[PDB]
Amino acid sequence: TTSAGESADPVTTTVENYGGETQIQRRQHTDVSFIMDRFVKVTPQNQINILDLMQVPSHTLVGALLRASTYYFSDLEIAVKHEGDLTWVPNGAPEKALDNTTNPTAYHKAPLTRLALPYTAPHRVLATVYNGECRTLPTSFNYGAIKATRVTELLYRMKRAETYCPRPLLAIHPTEARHKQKIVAPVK
Amino acid sequence: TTSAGESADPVTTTVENYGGETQIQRRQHTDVSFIMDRFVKVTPQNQINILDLMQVPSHTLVGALLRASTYYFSDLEIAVKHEGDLTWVPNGAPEKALDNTTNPTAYHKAPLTRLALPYTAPHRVLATVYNGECRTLPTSFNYGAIKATRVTELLYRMKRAETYCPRPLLAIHPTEARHKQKIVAPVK
Amino acid sequence: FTGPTDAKARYMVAYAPPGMEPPKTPEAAAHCIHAEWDTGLNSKFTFSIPYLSAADYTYTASDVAETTNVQGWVCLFQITHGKADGDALVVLASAGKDFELRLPVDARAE
Amino acid sequence: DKKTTTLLEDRILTTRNGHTTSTTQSSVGVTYGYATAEDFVSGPNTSGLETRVVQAERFFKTHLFDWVTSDSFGRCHLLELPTDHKGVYGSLTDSYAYMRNGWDVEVTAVGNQFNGGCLLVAMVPELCSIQKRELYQLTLFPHQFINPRTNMTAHITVPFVGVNRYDQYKVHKPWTLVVMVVAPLTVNTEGAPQIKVYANIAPTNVHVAGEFPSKE
C-alpha cells in the first residue's frame, strides 16, 4: 500500500495484498520479562563490588537488550563464588557498613551463594543513560554493594524486568555481503 | 488359510484353524515410547559435542531401533560427566555461543549433570536417512551442542519418542544352524 | 521517494526464491512475486517479503559453508524515471504481523 | 482528472493479477473494451477437455519505444499479442494445441508534468497494418490517452475475440496493442528530455486444450 511517508504512523502491510495468508505467531521468546530473566557473568573486583547492571558487557544478550531501553526497573538475583562470608548492603549505605555482619551476610557454603535482592534505589526507575554531564551515571543508580575476602565470580539476573523508551540495538557490521559464522552441525 | 499372495494385504492365521486357542498378549515392552525411553552411552569428543542421535551405535538397542524408523520426533535428556561447567546451545546456534554462559550452563556438581532439553530443530520431524547426496545428513538434523573443559561420558535418552515408516532391523547372521551364546545361569 | 515535485519514477520490488540465480532485469523478475509502483502525492510504498521455505523455520545466522543465500534475494529495480536523476529513494524495514523469533542465544565474543 | 496537487486521490489505483500488483497514483480509470466479461469458455470445439491455468494470469513486461521530440503525429508502435513469453504463459503455448485468454494491459509513459504532447493507446483486433488516414479513427477501438499534464498510465482490459472459440497462437494473433503519437512531445525548460514507454500486461482467463507430446 502507498501512504504518506512523512508521518510516523506505522504501516504494516501483509502478504494478503498479493494473495498470501498471514500465519499465527508465538512471541513468548521476545517477551521482555522472559528474555532478561537469566544469569549473565560480569568480571568482579577482588573484594568490594558495587551492584550495577551497567557492568554487564554491552555485547552480551542481557547487556545489549538492557541498553536498548532508556529507563528500567527490576528486582535482582546474584550468584557469587567467594572466599569467606559475603555481606550485602542496600543502596545509600556507607561503604564501611560492608564490614558489619548484621547487614545481610551469607556464610560460606560450597560451591557458591545465590541470593534474591529487592530493588533499593530512591528513584521510581533507573536509567541506562542520563544527560547530566554533557559516560557517568548518578551514584544513586545501583542495587547496593557486596564484599567478601575474595570474590572470584559474579553473575546478575534481572527479575520482573520492565523497560521504557527503546534505544538502538546493533548487530555486527560485516565486511562481506553477509556476516557468516560456523553454525553447530553433525560432524564430518 | 490360502490367499492371493501377490497382494500386500496382511494375513494373520491363528491356532484355532486346527483346534487350538489364541491366548492373551501383553505388549507393553514393545511400545515405542517405552522402549526408546532409557539412556544409551556414546563415545564423546573432548570438548564440543554436537547432540546427534545418529552417534548412538547401530548395534545397541536404542541405536538399532532408532534406525528401524525413517522419521522420528522426541524431546531429550542427557547425562554428562564433565570437568568445568557445561554449556548447551540450541539447534542453529553459531559454535562460538558455546563459550557464553548466559546460554544454559550447568555449574559442575559431582558426579555428573543430568538435563532435560526440548526438541529445537526447524523441521516438523527428523530422519535417520535422507536421500539428498546420492552417509551425510543435513546440518540442521541435531538437538543443539554442548561444551565443557573436558567431557568424559555422555548418555542420551529419548523422551516422548514417535517413529514413522519402519525400516529393516537385523539380528546377527550366524555361521552355525543357531546363534548360541552363554546365557546367565546359577553357578556349577 | 524524496525527489522534488517535478521528478517522477516507477519502481519494482521482487522476491527471488533460492534455487536459481536472481534476475538481472525487470523482464526476468516479472515472473517472480513482485509489485510495481510510481511516485505521486503519497511518498511511501510498503511491501511484504513472504516467508517461503522447505522447513517451518529458517536460521537467523548465515553459515560459512553456504555460498548462495539459502533464503533467496530481494531485487529492487527502476522501471523508468522522468527527470529523477540523482534523486534518493530511502528504504526501511520492519517486522510483519506474523514475524516471529525463537530460541534465545548469546553468540557474540565482542 | 476528477479527483483533487501532485498525482492523487481517487486517482490511486492498484491492480492485482495473481501474485503480482501494480499501483499508479495518476490513474484515469480503466477502459473495458467490447464487453465486461468473457463469452462461453466451454463449447463443442473442445469436447469438455479444456482447463483453466490460473498460474499464467499475472503481469509480464516489455519496453515498447522511446517517445522523442522528433516523432510526429501518426508515429506508431505495434505489439502483436501474444508475444514472446519466457514464463508460465509461454510454456503453455508449447504444451497445448488450443488456447484462449483476454488481456489486462497497462501502458506507462513516465516523463513529468512539464512535458506536453499526447499519446493514444489502443487495443485493436486483427491488425497487421494500418493506413495513415485510418489513424484518425483509431478511437473506434478500446483506448485511453496519456497526456503528461494529467497522467502517466493508460489501462485497458479486453476479452478474447475471434472467429474461433479457441485459437492456435502459433498461426494467429487476435489482438495488437498500438501506441500512437497524437501531439508531439514538448520538453520546454523543465520537462523530461524524452519518455520511455513500457507495457505491463497480464493474460486473463487462460484456458488450454489438446495436450501435445513432449519432444523426448
Add this chain to the structure above:
Amino acid sequence: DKKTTTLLEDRILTTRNGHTTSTTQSSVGVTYGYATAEDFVSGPNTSGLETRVVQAERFFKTHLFDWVTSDSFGRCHLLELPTDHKGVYGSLTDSYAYMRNGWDVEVTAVGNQFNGGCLLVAMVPELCSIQKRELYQLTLFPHQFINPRTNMTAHITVPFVGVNRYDQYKVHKPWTLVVMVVAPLTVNTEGAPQIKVYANIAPTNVHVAGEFPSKE
C-alpha cells in the same frame, strides 16, 4: 487371485489420472502405503502462496529393466522420484522453488502364464542404497508382488512424505521405486523368453510455491 480362465473378473481395474487411463485384466488390487490421503498441504512454510496444478496429474512412462533368466535373487533396479520429466510436471520443477506430490505407480512385467519366478515391487522413502541382508525385509515398505501364474501388474499409491512439508526436488528425492527379483525367471518350454519391466507413473496432488524468474 480371488476372482474366477485367462486374466479376468473383478481383476479388471481401470485407473484414470487426468486425461490418461490404464486398464489391466489381471489386477491383484492396489496397495496404499502409509496413508490413504495426504496430510495438510497448506502450512506456515508457504504463507498461503501455494497452488495446485492439476494439469501435471497424469501418467508418464519409463522402461525399468529386462528381467532375464540369469538374474538371481536380490537383483534390483532402483528409480529415484521425481525422475526426468519432459512434460508439464517437469516444467513445474524449473518454474517453482518448492513442490510436493504423492505418486500413483503401476509396474508391469508382461511375459505369459507359463513363465515362473517372482518380482517384488516396493516404494521406499529416502533410499539411496540398500545392503543384501536388508532385502529380506523389503516387505516392510509399501509393496506388491508380480508372479506370472497370477498377474502382470503391480499398483502402489503413496502420499508425499518428508521432514519438510514442501520439498526442493533438485536436491532431495523422497521416494525410490524398487523392483527386486525374489525367485529367478523360468521359461520352460512355453514361457516368454524374457520379460521387459515398465513403469506407468502419475504424480498426485501436485502443489507448487515460490515462482522463479525466467532465464530471459
Add this chain to the structure above:
Amino acid sequence: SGNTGSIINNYYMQQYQNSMDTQLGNDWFSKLASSAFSGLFGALLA
C-alpha cells in the same frame, strides 16, 4: 507414557519440562495389523 513411573505431579510446568506440540488445520500400523484377514478362504469340512 514412556518409561516414567512417579505418581506425584511434576514440580515444573509442562511448558518447561517438554517442548509444546502445535496442530495444523493416526496409527497406520495398528490399523494395518487389525485389518489382517484371519479367516479361511474356501469351504470348511468337519
Add this chain to the structure above:
Amino acid sequence: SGNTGSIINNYYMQQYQNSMDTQLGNDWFSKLASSAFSGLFGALLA
C-alpha cells in the same frame, strides 16, 4: 511471568521474595503496533 516454571507455591511470602510496588493517584508500544495501518490507500482492481 518471566523465566519461572515451578507449579508449587513459593515457600516464602511475597513481601520477602520481591520488593512490593506502590501506586500513585499502559503498554505504549503494544498500542502503537496494533494501531498500524494494514489496508490499501486507493481503489483495488481484480
